[PDB]
Amino acid sequence: EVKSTTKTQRIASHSHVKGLGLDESGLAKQAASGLVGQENAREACGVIVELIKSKKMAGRAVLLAGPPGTGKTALALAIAQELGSKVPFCPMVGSEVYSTEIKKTEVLMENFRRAIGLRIKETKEVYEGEVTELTPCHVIIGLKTAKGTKQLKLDPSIFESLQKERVEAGDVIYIEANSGAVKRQGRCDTYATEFDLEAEEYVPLPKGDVHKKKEIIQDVTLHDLDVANATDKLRGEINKVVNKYIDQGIAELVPGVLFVDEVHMLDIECFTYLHRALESSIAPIVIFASNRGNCVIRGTEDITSPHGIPLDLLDRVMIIRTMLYTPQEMKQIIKIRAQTEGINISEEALNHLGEIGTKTTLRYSVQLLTPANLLAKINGKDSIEKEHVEEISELFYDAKSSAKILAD
C-alpha cells in the first residue's frame, strides 16, 4: 500500500531493544532483549504494560524522571515493543512545538497521529508458495503450493525485489497477485533440516492453491495516511474512511506510545491540549521524560511545579525514576551498541570508553564509536584500540567541557 513516515534517525540509536525482558514472575534478569541493568524501572515499566493490557490506564500517564543518558527513551521504546508486534512509537521533544511556520496545534496533532496505529487485515488470493525454479525472461517462475508447481509471469522489477529480499530456491514467500510484490516470510519445509521446524522461520507447503487465501496484516499509522494523499479536510476524510474500515471489520485500532522528552519546554496551553487528548477511549500511552526539577511553567510567571508540569495533569501521572548506570553496566551497554553497529572494539578500549561514559554521559560515548572506527580504518586497522579512543576523545568534546573551556 503505502510507505512508512517514521523518523528512523531517532530510533536507530535504540536498535538493540527487543522488549523489556522480564520472566514469568516479573523479576528483572538484568540482561535480556538488549536492555541491561536498571531493574527497578524495567519492573515498573512491565507493571505499566500490564495496566495498559487490562485497560486500567483510563487517563493516567507515565513520567520518567532521571539524568540524561539513563535509558528513558530506551525504556519507552521497550514498552512500545512489549505492547505488541509493531505498536507504533513516536519520540519527540517539547522544543518542536515552537515552530515559526506551523502552529503548536499542528505539531501536537501530527505527533499524536504518529503514535496510534492501524492494523489492516484482509484475506487475499496471493501467490504464497515456494520458489522452485526461476527463469528470468517474462520472468517465468515456478511456485509450488499444496496444488503443485505453477508457472507465473512476473516483471523484472519483481525479480529485482526478490534479489533485494535475498531469496533462494526453497523459500515460502507471497508475491502479490493484484499488483506484484515480494516480501520475505521464511523458507520452505520441503527442504527443512532437523533444527528447522514448521510454523516458524521455515513454513510448510502453503495450503490451498497458488492463489492462496492468506490473511495479510499490514501495520500503518494515520500519519502515513495523511501523507499518502499527495488541511483539516484531508484529516477529516481519512477520519471517515478509517471509521468505515473499522465498522467493516477488516481494521483494528491499536494505541501506540507517544514519548515526550524535555517536558518542561511545553507551554501550559500544550499541557491542556495533552490533557484533552488523554481523555479519549483511543489514545497513546503518553510517556513524559524530565530532567529539570521544580520549574517555572512556560506561559506563566513566578509559578513553580514539579518537573515543569501543571498540577492539573501531573496528578494523573505515575513517576518512575531511572538511576545512573554503573561502569560495569556502562561497558555492557556500550558493547551491545558496538556489536549492533558492527564496530569491533577491544577490551581496554571498552574500559576507557566506560570511564568516559561515567565521566560525562552515555549518549556522548555512543556517538564516540563511529569516529573511533573511522580513525582506526584510516590508520590501516580493523579494530579500535585504546590509543585510538584516547585520540578521538581528545579531538572531540562534549557540551559541558567545551563550555567550561570557553568560559576561561
Partner 1 sequence: KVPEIRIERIGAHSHIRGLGLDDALEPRQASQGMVGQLAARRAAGVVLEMIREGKIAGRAVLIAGQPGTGKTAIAMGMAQALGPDTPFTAIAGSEIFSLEMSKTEALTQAFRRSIGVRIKEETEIIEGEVVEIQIDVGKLTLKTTEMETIYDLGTKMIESLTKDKVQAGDVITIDKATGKISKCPDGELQKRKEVVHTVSLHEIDVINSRFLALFSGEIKSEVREQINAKVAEWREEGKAEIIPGVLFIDEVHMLDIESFSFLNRALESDMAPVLIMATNRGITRIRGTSYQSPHGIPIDLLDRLLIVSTTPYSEKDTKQILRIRCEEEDVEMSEDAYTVLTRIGLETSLRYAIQLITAASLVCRKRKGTEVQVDDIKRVYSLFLDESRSTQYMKEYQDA
Residue 315, CA atoms < 13 Å, CB-side half-sphere: 2
**Euclidean distance between CA atoms 258 and 147, whole angstroms:** 47
| By CB under 8 A, residue 173 contacts partner 1 | no
| By CB under 8 A, residue 220 contacts partner 1 | no
Nearest C-alpha neighbor of 312 from the set 277, 268, 350: 268
| By CB under 8 A, residue 93 contacts partner 1 | yes
Q: Is 70 annotated as a binding residue?
A: yes
Smallest distance, partner 1 to C-beta of residue 371, A: 5
What is the total count of residues that contact partner 1 (CB under 8 A)?
A: 109
| By CB under 6 A, residue 333 contacts ligand ADP | yes
Smallest distance, ligand ADP to C-beta of residue 31, A: 8
Nearest C-alpha neighbor of 39 from the set 24, 22, 16: 22
Q: What is the DSSP string of 320-387?
A: EE-PPPPHHHHHHHHHHHHHHTT--B-HHHHHHHHHHHHHS-SHHHHHTSHHHHHHHHHHT-SSB-HH
Q: Is 304 annotated as a binding residue?
A: no
Among 298, 329, 330, 384, binds partner 1 (CB under 8 A): 298
> Which listed option, partner 1, ligand ADP, none, makes contact with residue 356 (CB within 5 to 8 Å by class)?
none
In angstroms and rounded to an integer, the radius of gyration of the C-alpha atoms of the chain is 25
Smallest distance, partner 1 to C-beta of residue 299, A: 7
DSSP alpha helix (H) spans, 229-286 = 232-248, 268-277
Nearer to ligand ADP, 73 or 393 (CB): 73
- In the numeric block, the cell 558493547 is attached to 335
Q: 312 near 284, Cβ under 8 Å?
A: no
| By CB under 6 A, residue 393 contacts ligand ADP | no
Contact window for ligand ADP (CB under 6 A) among 71-79, 121-129, 135-143, 373-381: 71-79
> Which listed option, partner 1, ligand ADP, none, makes contact with residue 364 (CB within 5 to 8 Å by class)?
partner 1
What is the total count of residues that contact ligand ADP (CB under 6 A)?
A: 20
Q: Which residues pair with 296 in a beta bridge?
A: 304
Smallest distance, partner 1 to C-beta of residue 110, A: 11
Locate the DSSP E strands across 100-256. 117-135, 140-144, 149-153, 172-175, 182-184, 187-188, 202-203, 211-221, 251-254
Q: Is 72 annotated as a binding residue?
A: yes
Q: Which residues inside 6-35 make contact with ligand ADP, applying CB under 6 A?
A: 13-14, 17, 34-35
In the 8-state DSSP scheme, what is residue 298? Answer: B
> Which listed option, partner 1, ligand ADP, none, makes contact with residue 58 (CB within 5 to 8 Å by class)?
partner 1
C-alpha cell at 335: 558493547
Q: Is 73 annotated as a binding residue?
A: yes
Smallest distance, ligand ADP to C-beta of residue 340, A: 9
Listed in sequence order, the residues at least 6 apart from 253 whose beta carbon sits closer than 8 Å to its beta carbon are 116, 117, 118, 242, 246, 282
C-alpha cell at 226: 495523511
**Euclidean distance between CA atoms 177 and 122, whole angstroms:** 14
Per-residue binding letters, 363-392, with ligand ADP (x by CB under 6 A): x--x--------------------------
Q: Which residues inside 39-68 make contact with ligand ADP, applying CB under 6 A?
A: 68
Q: 139 near 159, Cβ under 8 Å?
A: yes
| By CB under 8 A, residue 7 contacts partner 1 | yes
Residue nearest to ligand ADP (CB): 71
Q: 146 near 94, Cβ under 8 Å?
A: no
Q: Which residues inside 247-306 make contact with ligand ADP, applying CB under 6 A?
A: 261
**Euclidean distance between CA atoms 375 and 380, whole angstroms:** 9
**Euclidean distance between CA atoms 238 and 223, whole angstroms:** 10
Among 38, 161, 290, 393, binds ligand ADP (CB under 6 A): 38
Backbone φ and ψ of 260, nearest 5°: -125, 100
| By CB under 8 A, residue 123 contacts partner 1 | no
Nearer to partner 1, 10 or 352 (CB): 10
Among 69, 88, 256, 354, binds ligand ADP (CB under 6 A): 69
Q: 143 near 126, Cβ under 8 Å?
A: no
Site residues (CB under 6 A) for ligand ADP?
A: 13-14, 17, 34-38, 68-74, 261, 333, 362-363, 366
Q: Annotated binding site, which residues?
A: 66-73
Q: Which residues define the annotated binding site for ATP?
A: 66-73
